[PDB]
Each structure stands twice: as structure tokens, then as C-alpha cells.
Design a protein around this nucleic acid. Structure first.
Ligand SMILES: [Mn+2]
Ligand SMILES: [Mn+2]
Ligand SMILES: [Mn+2]
Ligand SMILES: [Mn+2]
Ligand SMILES: [Mn+2]
Ligand SMILES: [Mn+2]
Lengths: 241, 235
DNA sequence: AAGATATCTT
DNA sequence: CAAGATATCT
């Protein structure tokens, strides 16, 4: 499938290459900084041609948002089925020590999830799948000078334990918010193999959704409705009260 | 000065070089995506070597934060007087007049040590390196094809200016409460034709700006109403 | 104006 | 954790 091949290929590409800098037309290279955003940006640019290569080997077109603040990074679809779109987002986190537990921010829970068309490239109901390509690395100077193409193997790299997975968003979604004032779904908090294997907390994609479409924006209010999965099934069990 | 040399070095670098992709140690290059999370990341790293070089030429230690949501990008300071620190932040925006976002108005400026590398009272200057550009491929390239790689921008312009001089009176962001710069012409930022009469005024004004339009309306919404408020005894 | 896009600190 | 920081756009 498109899926087994995308992960095999991102997987393979990660094993074979190491981004070490950004380069200019003239050939001068500038090392990578350490802070998180440099790396999310980079893993994302890293994924892009791979995603496109596999997509067209299977015949799907790939459309990135033509506008900012719009989900998802990549919209895949066969013209044959415009209502079977596939959303692919990139999510990244770090580790201070290899193989420790991790969590990601999975996107807003108050735009397209509640409003079919807010901040999303196509209406929400035209997608049948929402995948997350997740990157995990261990955060790790000669990083402040520039280099030339002949010194590529000695440029210091801001990280080292890079791992990559591809999994359905509802599947690794957790029950606590991933951020506050920017209202993001939080993923589970767990080791890398738990993301690869699907050991999430929802029973289904409808439960993930119903949960996030009714979770209050603050602890205040979550006091009265529900604040985690157990309470939320108690509230459902009672009649949504 | 440290200032005029950094300014001249950044103009020069900007002029001579065009960032066009990220490169791997095996020699494979990935082109640049379009959204902004990308350009700000790239200009910031593009700025790194120049800042550490001009700083060293002047006797300053350069320092970045460990914790990632901590201002400023660069803290410059001579070892001998750790108490006169210089803050350098990078801010970017696109052109099709421009406005930038300039950082929070509720963290360190109101409470001396929040989200900041060194207590706010230890910095005696806050500079903004501003990058503006005009907003214009899914395969990979090799070192020989550098000039074939599409660039998501055209015509970058860089300026260096004190954060207070270019600060405006309208929030530059809502839920992330950012100070907004003036909304003007690039020349204006270079020439420093701001609206505050002093940095004392810019800081008192953002230290006391309210979060929502509602509350702001009972206090002030712009520099005019703020100068009225001062006249009423801050009430 | 307010709240989206990503993820980290406290 | 929950809340609010990092940048900057609609
Ligand atoms: Mn994207
Ligand atoms: Mn994304
Ligand atoms: Mn829209
Ligand atoms: Mn930085
Ligand atoms: Mn900054
Ligand atoms: Mn701190």
C-alpha cells in the first residue's frame, strides 16, 4: 500500500541521510542550531520529496496548504476519489536521554475538528485518513562558523538519536491537551514503540473525535464535564451530563 | 561600534548569499518549503555566524538559550561587566507596509525573570535584526545543481534597530500577546521613525496594555488614549 | 481582533 | 499538569 511504502521509505531515508546544514546557491553552508523549531522545520523539509515520490508511484497528487495556518502539511488524493483524501502532518519532539517517554502536539481541537471548514485545506469530511509522521531525536562550538561543501562530514549536528514513525492521529491521540492558549490535542505520553504499535487510549476514531469535540478549554470547566478519558466515559455512561 | 559593524556585516552577507536548501553530510540537498516557520528558521541560522564573528571582534561572549521559549536569541556580554548585557532578537515578515511581532508583553517586561535568559535588568539594550522578503519543488538535488533549486522568496532586506524605536501600540498577536511593531515602510524601520517618545514610554505602555478589547476600552487602545490615562493619574 | 499553524517550560 | 511562552500569520 501507499502506507507501507511511505513508512519503509521515510524509514530508509532516515537511516541513510543526516541533515547537517542549510546551504546557499554559491555553496556556503551554515550549521543547524539546537532549538526545536529548527529541527521540526528541517524534518519536515526532509519528508517532503519522499512523501511526493511515494504518492506519485501510487498515483496520488500531493497539495500543500496554499495558505498559512492551514492543516495539513500534506493533502494526498486520486482525482478518482476526492472524498477519500489523506491528511499527513509532521510532528516532532525531543529527548534529553535516548529511549525515554515522549509526547507530541497533534493539532488544534477547536478549528476543523468542530467546524468542517475552519483552517483546513479541504472540508474535514473529504478526508478518510489522518496520519502523523512523527520524528523523535536526542538533543545534543564549531557550529558557529560557516563551511564549504568540501567539509560536509565534519559539521557538527544538533542531535543524534533520530527515530521515525507513521501512525493514524486518532490512534496515538491522548486525553490531555498538548498546549494551553493554542488549544492542541495532546498525544499519549509513552515510549517510541508505543507510537509504532498503536498502544493509544481511544477505542475508536469516533470516541477520539467525540472526546475532543467536547473537551472544555480550561481546567475550570473540565472540572464540571470531564478532564480525562475515564471521566469522559463516566459522562457518556450517564447521558452526557 | 559593535552596532555599526554588525549592521554592515549583515547587509554584506545578505547581499552575497542566497539560502536555497538544507544539505545532508552525504551531499544530498532538500529544497525550502513555503510557509513562514521555514523562513524565520533559515534567516535566524543564516545570522548566527555573522553575530558570533562581530561579537568576538569586539570582545563579547555570545550566548543562546538552552530552554527553547526563552528570549533573546543572542545575549552578548563582555565577561568583565556581565551587568551591561545586549539583547539581540530576529524577527521576520513578508511583503506583497509591514509590521512585525516583537515578543510577548506579559513575560519578562512585567516580571523581570520570566522566559528570559538573564534577569531583564541586566540588559542595557534590545536590538531587533529584522528580515523582510517578497513571497514568491518536491524533488532533491546534488551539489552540482544548486542554481536550479527554486527559492521560496525574492529580495530580502535586513535592518538592525532598537526594539523600542520600532514598537507600535496595537498588539501584533492575540492569544500569544505579542507586542506589535509600527505598521510602516521598510525605510521607517531603518530610519527609526517610531511613535513612542522614549523607551520609558514604550515599556510603560506594554507593561500596562490589557489583553482584550473589552478591558482595553476602559483603559487605552492606542498611544493617544494611553497618554490620556497618564494625564488622569493612571486610572 | 482574536485565534490559527508547532511544541516546549514551569 | 495547566497555563502560558517561543514566531507570525489569517
Ligand atoms: Mn507545512
Ligand atoms: Mn503541520
Ligand atoms: Mn480557510
Ligand atoms: Mn533562537
Ligand atoms: Mn526570537
Ligand atoms: Mn526560565
Amino acid at each position: 500500500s501507499l502506507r507501507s511504502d511511505l513508512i519503509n521509505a521515510l524509514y530508509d531515508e532516515n537511516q541513510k541521510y543526516d541533515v547537517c546544514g542549510i546551504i546557499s546557491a554559491e555553496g556556503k553552508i551554515y550549521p543547524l542550531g539546537s532549538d526545536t523549531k529548527v529541527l521540526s522545520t528541517i524534518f519536515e523539509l526532509f519528508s517532503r520529496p519522499i512523501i511526493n515520490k511515494i504518492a506519485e508511484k501510487h498515483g496520488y497528487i500531493v497539495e500543500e496548504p496554499k495558505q498559512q495556518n492551514h492543516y495539513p502539511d500534506f493533502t494526498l488524493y486520486k482525482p478518482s476519489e476526492p472524498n477519500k483524501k489523506i491528511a499527513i502532518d509532521i510532528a516532532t519532539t525531543y529527548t534529553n536521554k535516548e529511549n525515554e517517554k515522549i509526547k507530541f502536539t497533534l493539532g488544534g481541537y477547536t478549528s476543523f475538528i468542530r467546524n468542517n471548514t475552519k483552517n483546513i485545506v479541504y472540508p474535514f469530511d473529504q478526508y478518510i485518513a489522518h496520519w502523523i509522521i512523527g520524528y523523535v531525536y536526542t538533543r545534543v562550538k564549531s557550529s558557529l562558523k560557516t563551511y564549504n561543501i568540501n567539509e560536509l562530514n565534519e559539521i557538527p549536528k544538533p542531535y543524534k538519536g533520530v527515530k521515525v514513525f507513521l501512525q493514524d492521529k486518532w490512534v496515538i491521540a491522548g486525553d490531555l491537551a498538548g498546549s494551553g492558549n493554542t488549544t492542541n490535542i495532546g498525544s499519549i505520553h509513552a515510549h517510541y514503540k508505543d507510537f509504532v504499535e498503536g498502544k493509544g487510549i481511544f477505542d475508536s476514531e469516533d470516541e477520539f473525535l467525540d472526546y475532543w469535540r467536547n473537551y472544555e478549554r480550561t481546567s475550570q470547566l473540565r472540572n464540571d464535564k470531564y478532564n480525562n478519558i475515564s471521566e469522559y466515559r463516566n459522562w457518556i455512561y450517564r447521558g452526557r451530563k
